Amino acid sequence: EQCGRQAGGKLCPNNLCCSQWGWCGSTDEYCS
Numbered sequence: 001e002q003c004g005r006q007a008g009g010k011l012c013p014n015n016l017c018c019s020q021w022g023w024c025g026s027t028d029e030y031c032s
């Protein structure tokens with residue numbers, strides 16, 4: 001994926017959250 005464990009620990013741009021599955025968001029599905 002793009003971020004988190006399923007990307008090997010990358011983070012997200014500007015200010016957004018990173019989903020439990022590993023993608024960027026800033027919404028609950030992507031902060032939880």
Ligand SMILES: CC(=O)N[C@@H]1[C@@H](O)[C@H](O[C@@H]2O[C@H](CO)[C@@H](O[C@@H]3O[C@H](CO)[C@@H](O)[C@H](O)[C@H]3NC(C)=O)[C@H](O)[C@H]2NC(C)=O)[C@@H](CO)O[C@H]1O
Binds near residue numbers: 001020021022023030
């Ligand atoms: C309950 C569960 O975990 N079921 C498994 C599936 O989740 C898994 O596929 C993954 O699904 C998620 C959710 O649809 C995918 O995330 C989304 O991926 C798109 C890719 O275009 C991304 O743009 C979205 O932002 C992102 N959403 C979120 C909330 O992060 C994820 O990429 C899938 N990963 C993979 C490697 O397939 C399937 C396998 O396909 O298995 C289920 O057991």
